[PDB]
Amino acid sequence: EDEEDIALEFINGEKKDKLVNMNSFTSMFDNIQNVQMDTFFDRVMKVLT
Amino acid sequence: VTCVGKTFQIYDANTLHLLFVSEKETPSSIVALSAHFHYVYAAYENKVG
Amino acid sequence: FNSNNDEKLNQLVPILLEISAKLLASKSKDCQIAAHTILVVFATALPLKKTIILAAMETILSNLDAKEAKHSALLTICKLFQTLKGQGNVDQLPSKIFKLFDSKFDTVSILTFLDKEDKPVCDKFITSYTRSIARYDRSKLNIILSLLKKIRLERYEVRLIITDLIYLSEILEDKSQLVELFEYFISINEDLVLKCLKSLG
Amino acid sequence: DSPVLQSAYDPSGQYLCYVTVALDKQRVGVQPTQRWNENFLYLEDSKLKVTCLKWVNVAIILGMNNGEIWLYSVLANEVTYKFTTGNSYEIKDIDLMGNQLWCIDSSDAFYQFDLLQFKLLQHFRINNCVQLNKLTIVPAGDSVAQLLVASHSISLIDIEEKKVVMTFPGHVSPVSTLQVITNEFFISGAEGDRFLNVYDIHSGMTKCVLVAESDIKELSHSGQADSIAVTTEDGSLEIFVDPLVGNKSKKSSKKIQIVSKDG
Amino acid sequence: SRISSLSFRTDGSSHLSVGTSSGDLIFYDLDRRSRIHVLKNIHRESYGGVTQATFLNGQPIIVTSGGDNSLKEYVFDPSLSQGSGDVVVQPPRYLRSRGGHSQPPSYIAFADSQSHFMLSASKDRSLWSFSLRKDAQSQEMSQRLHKKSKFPEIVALAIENARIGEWENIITAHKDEKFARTWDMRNKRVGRWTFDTTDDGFVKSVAMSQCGNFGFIGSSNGSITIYNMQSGILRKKYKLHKRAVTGISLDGMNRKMVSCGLDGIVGFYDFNKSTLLGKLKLDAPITAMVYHRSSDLFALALDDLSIVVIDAVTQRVVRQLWGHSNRITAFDFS
């Protein structure tokens, strides 16, 4: 085995994630009234995921 | 007051316009400058002017 | 006032992380998880040094008392390690952070966290947590076996876990749970276990 | 320009070591001048570059931009030992006499090494040397008692006194070559210059100014001032026959060129 | 980091300005125990970064200096909040500065007959204009290009003023550049025209007519190309020299042209009728040329350490000068 193989193994193991754009959290203001703010954090994670 | 090789130049902070310049060049490069009102102390080799 | 400019995110980070630290300092559970909401976005928006990522957990876990904030904290901490993408991505937590995490989050708590089907991606943390267990706690080695079954970890992460456990066998006494952990690696992906053994002994 | 970034004959003149860049990685190779060796040392990182190449009497010492010196055995095809200075400044020049080894950094700090012992002996900086692109050790007896250093002018320094003993007015451009043709007569040449100044070490007066057709790249000296061969920038070789014998300025006597049959 | 300078703000604000050899100036609010701002790369790290940074007494302006031949002033503007001004602090704003070449100048030339300004090129790839009066004004020529890093250092330059203010009036040659760039004094900006040697040779000589309509380029391969400044269009090309052309000149009458090269020949031409008037061979290669238009005399720096003066009218050596003990760097006519 060689260290370069281990490096490519790290790289293969890596996985994608949903990037954040400008228009991702604009709709929060629409549903910002009378919402349990725990639910607001849950929605934040849902959009982020 | 700023050191320029073997001579010093004094600038007016309002405009950075030159006010005076050393009448003669020092025999040795100036190592330190200290300014007090109308008098500026210039040090070169083993002599302070 | 920034958005896309990557240079210009960086000047926000002094301002808004200090706000998050103050919010975490507030005893109000609402203030703390607001900082959890704040912190998680910046980690994904901009990659940050593991030292800062580590320092955030220390602040998050210091005043973590409310149950709801405990749920929010565990989602953030996993996400922050997901963003971490450098050498030490899955390296073990230090002694103090590991002690702090287990105190606020017992092993049974995370086993429930792994249990739920809708769990967020946390393999990097579990790999980092898994190694921290082996280094510092010998009794919890059985719990490592349960954790690995619950969550499928990345191939390099499994290799690194196998690497440390090989050292543990040489140093720490052989145990039924330890061989079971090896036998678990024997059952799944036989060949990679040999590669770790070949490279290490 | 030429692909060969740097090159150097061995003292015997029978083997030439040259460096070229393959993709973004420099590879060092040696070929027999008198008459293929397909084996090249490869620098594993793109940033790594060799700044200096010198033969050792079968090892070649390599200066690099990192701030360390590598001893390379061509037969084995691996670096036997690496001399690392405390600093990370690039090495500008290097020179050798037996075990003695002297190198200079871009921070203008002198350093001394021992090949046999693999140790840094001393490291000192002498004032009035703002820059240092050339280092040459004078061949006095079997020990180093003076050193010739040039950046744009030329300066002579004593190791024991750690101070300049003499200064020579050099070229406007940075000095490229500082070979010592004989005692009290060392030649000097600068980048982008067609003139070579020969200076007297003891007296300091320019004995002669040798003039070439075009810019000079490399210099070779024969015997003791018997003949000087200089490789011009245009790709021609000029030979100076007895340059140390109007008198101030001398020109090339023989010129050599290579042209293909096609033209 | 390495500390190079320190100073406090005496305007009633508990601020500390922290300088570093890296060229970075940091400001701290001691009352609040926080960093106000960092000013990056104000002075070159290679030249010692910020050598000295001092707040003016009782004032929000800070003066900063370094080894890069630059003196700058920055002003802390007042806060945009009537309340909590200490928290809400404006970042420092550049106020005024003085500077010059960071390395020894390569070439110089007098901008105008009145002798008030000079043009200067240095190895730092910057073209500067310096005033010769007490004002001591200094500006950097803009390198922003016209559209229809710094350029390599200038290896030849000439200036004319018969035609300033309507099109380009400067020609410059750079090291290892196969073409020449034009500049305009009045706009103080790089020009819109580029002149190429057209023979795969490097530019070695740049010269201009007194009328300011023709630009002359000497190539390393021995060709002389002629462009028109207003349109930057090649009009005439000459090929007599086989080696590099080290000097080109033209008379004020715009009739007789003289050229010299490393091959050692001096070519005499009729610009109007475009003919070879005569060719003169010298013993040694010619290094440089200076043409005195009023007297129609020009001197040549030969490799034998001599200055040979020739009269263009009769094409004969009139005076030869000996005494220099090495190559001659430069010379000029009174």
Place this chain on the structure above:
Amino acid sequence: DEGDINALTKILSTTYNYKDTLSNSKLLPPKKLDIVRLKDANASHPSHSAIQSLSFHPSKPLLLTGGYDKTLRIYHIDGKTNHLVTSLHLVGSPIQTCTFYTSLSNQNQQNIFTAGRRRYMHSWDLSLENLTHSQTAKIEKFSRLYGHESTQRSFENFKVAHLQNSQTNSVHGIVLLQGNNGWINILHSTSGLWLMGCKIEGVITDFCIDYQPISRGKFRTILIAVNAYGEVWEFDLNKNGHVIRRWKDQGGVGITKIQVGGGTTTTCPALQISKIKQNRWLAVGSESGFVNLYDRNTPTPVAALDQLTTTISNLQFSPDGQILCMASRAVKDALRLVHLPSCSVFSNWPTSGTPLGKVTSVAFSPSGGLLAVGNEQGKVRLWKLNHY
């Protein structure tokens, strides 16, 4: 006035730099790509026609270029001078594609295969001193299909892959061809013998190859075939070119080509048996401009890249396979780089000022992170990815 909670506040004070240094990071940044332009390849000796194909030498620092000039111009890519090693004019043989080849077992063996809109193909033996020293050359023309002449009209489209004969465990090269009606003809690289044939429904437009390791010293070669403007296929070559899997690309319209990466391939060949690796990415182009990316680890594409809007004439992964370059010959500057697995196009590069022209050929160096892009003007521009 003169784990702990205030740790976060402390670490903010210590440093004003907050980006984790990318020098340590081994995965290139998502949206920011660090690229610097270098000297061009064809500057030393220009080509008189468009650059139809480019190919990096597997190990040596050489570049191969071909075009309708009918010349195989070889350059020593050094990034600063790029001088020409050797060239070969083939009268009456327009070069539609060309490629280096190294025998997987015999590293000493070197060969170049080239063909065009002709019923023959040329081989160029680079073994021993032929590349540079030899005054005269060893060349072989493959013009015999052994009774399958009807299926094939020309050799213009081909690729070279490695086939392991499991019954004897020997490994040898194979030359792959595109037939008239969904036909793929399989030939021996050296002897030229016809080995096997694969057939698909519809018009074959493109195909690619994937390697599946089995055990130590054992690997299998898989052929994948695609249709012009929507549809896909697959075969297994080590069991006589029979089908082993069928699937359709979702939203299967647009299509022009297909490619695999993350492991061994034409651009990233292996040097020994152990280096053979499976490709974890599959990209299927289109002339509409879409790119359906599939994770090889009916399938659902992970992403549908739609930045480009024209003929995707070049799909290629990086040798280590985190970057997809998608390029078009229809119009100028129609080239994009897609980060993987994020599937996000880089924004900083290319720019409007980027000189690309009518992109007709692209090549990734096996190592050193070099990108070569040819254009219809006969010009190859070179770039360096600073991350590698």
Place this chain on the structure above:
Amino acid sequence: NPKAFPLADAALTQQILDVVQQAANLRQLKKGANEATKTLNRGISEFIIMAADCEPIEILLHLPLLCEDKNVPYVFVPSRVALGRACGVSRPVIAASITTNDASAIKTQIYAVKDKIETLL
């Protein structure tokens, strides 16, 4: 998708999509369900293509009612993403119509597929 009847086979869909692409370049194509309705109102529709995977399928089932009233052939293709791609748009299209033009350059191919769809019906 039982409601979608008749549904073209793998072969036929390829020919239909090829014609759809050619009509798109020649601006002979009106794409989208409502445009498809507009064409039937004027009787300028040569035939209409719909996607079976549309959900709810109801939003296009009205076109068959219009189509049989006006004796215009119609057909169903499996994928909506494929059809919109064939149209030349960045969004899936559930329905498309070929406008009638006896002076078009692709008249023969359009009339050919119309006959096949007529046989399918």
Place this chain on the structure above:
Amino acid sequence: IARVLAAKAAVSLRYDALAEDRDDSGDIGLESRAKVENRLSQLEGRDLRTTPKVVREAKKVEMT
């Protein structure tokens, strides 16, 4: 909104009319509204008049 609402009305309508086994729930209508309401909100949030930025004139500073 009239153009958008009319388009969704046809969507909701034709499910009501042409559905063989429609559930009397209006779910297709319910989801259609949220699209229109979201369309209204973002359209509503748009401001035709350009925002004025915070004016920051580099006022003259003269030494005292």
Place this chain on the structure above:
RNA sequence: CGAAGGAUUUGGUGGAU
């Protein structure tokens, strides 16, 4: 044409007038 974009407007400072 074209090395890590182009087009317009505008605040401030510096130098001349």
